[PDB]
């Protein structure tokens, strides 16, 4: 209901071609890695396989809202 309103307000007038803080300061990104498995290591091709969950977190002051909802839990749609 009102999560739709929050989402529509967040994206209205929003440019995803521009990183947050485009001309102010570098965007700081904190990264986490969960390693599901480190696959076979074939020396023939000098390569190895790895399966991970790759987490990235950063601040976007354009994605700032005020509501009783504290976190928006979304899928890949957005």
């Amino acid at each position: 209901g009102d999560v739709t309103v929050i989402l529509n307000n967040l994206l209205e007038g929003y440019d995803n071609k521009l990183r947050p803080d485009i001309g102010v300061k570098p965007t700081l990104i904190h990264t986490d890695m969960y390693v599901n498995s480190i696959g076979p290591v074939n020396a023939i091709n000098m390569e190895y396989t790895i399966d991970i969950f790759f987490a990235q977190t950063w601040y976007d002051r354009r994605l700032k809202f005020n509501s009783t909802i504290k976190v928006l839990r979304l899928n890949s749609n957005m």
Binding site: G1, V3, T4, L7, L74, N75, N77, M78
Partner: protein, 51 residues
Amino acid sequence: DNTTVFTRILDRLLDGYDNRLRPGLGERVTEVKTDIFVTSFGPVSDHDMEY
């Protein structure tokens, strides 16, 4: 001309519908009932430890 009435039904279903929100987001937990029918249990690959 069932086409127009059914087109209206679908359009009304998708009007004001937000697919970024799971059903019952506000006041419920979405319960998904799952079921698998295996049409073929493929070959098992020992070398890759997979099937």
